[PDB]
Amino acid sequence: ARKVTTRWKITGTLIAETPLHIGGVGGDADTDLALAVNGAGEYYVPGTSLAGALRGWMTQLLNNDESQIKDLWGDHLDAKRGASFV
RNA sequence: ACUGAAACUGUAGUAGAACCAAUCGGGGUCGUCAAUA
């Protein structure tokens, strides 16, 4: 497989400090923009939407350096990066 | 007159940007109603 010196499980509670809206495709007959729901119909944060939230912030932190970002979040086109480590 | 073996359809990607639940409105004030004798 991919070598992993150490795997880290990072977890905790995220609280909405303001209201939240991750959108699905949009519109449930009660709202023009409808919240994203999982296959069980439960309201959820897509891991895509949180990954890009955290990668996006990190991109601003690291002055939009592609190198260290792709070192942690993967890259489709570098010949030595591929899949994400987060 | 002899089954090929082995191989993740996967990798990167924030359903998001913009949008005022808002515009107008004195809690106000007078003669009506019935049809005959």
Nucleotide nearest to A54 (CA to C1'): B14
- PDB resolution in Å: 2.8
CB distance A71 to A82 below 8 Å: no
Q: Say whether A45 sits in a helix, a strand or coil.
A: coil
Within 10 A of A62 (CB to CB), how many other CB atoms are there? 13
Q: Which of residues 42-81 of A touch strand B (CB under 7 A)?
A: 46, 48-49, 51-53, 55-57, 73-76
Angle at A9 between CA A6 and CA A13, to 5 degrees: 160
Placement of tokens 């979040």 in the chain: A73
Tokens of A82: 């591929």
Q: Is the CB of A3 under 7 A from strand B?
A: no
Within 10 A of A59 (CB to CB), how many other CB atoms are there? 16
List the one residue out of A10, A38, A34 whose CA is nearest residue A21: A34
Residue type, A67: S
In sequence order, which residues have a C-beta less than 8 Å from that of residue A33 and are 6 or more positions away? A21, A23, A26, A27
In sequence order, which residues have a C-beta less than 8 Å from that of residue A46 and are 6 or more positions away? A22, A36
Chain B footprint positions (protein CB, under 7 Å): 8, 10-16
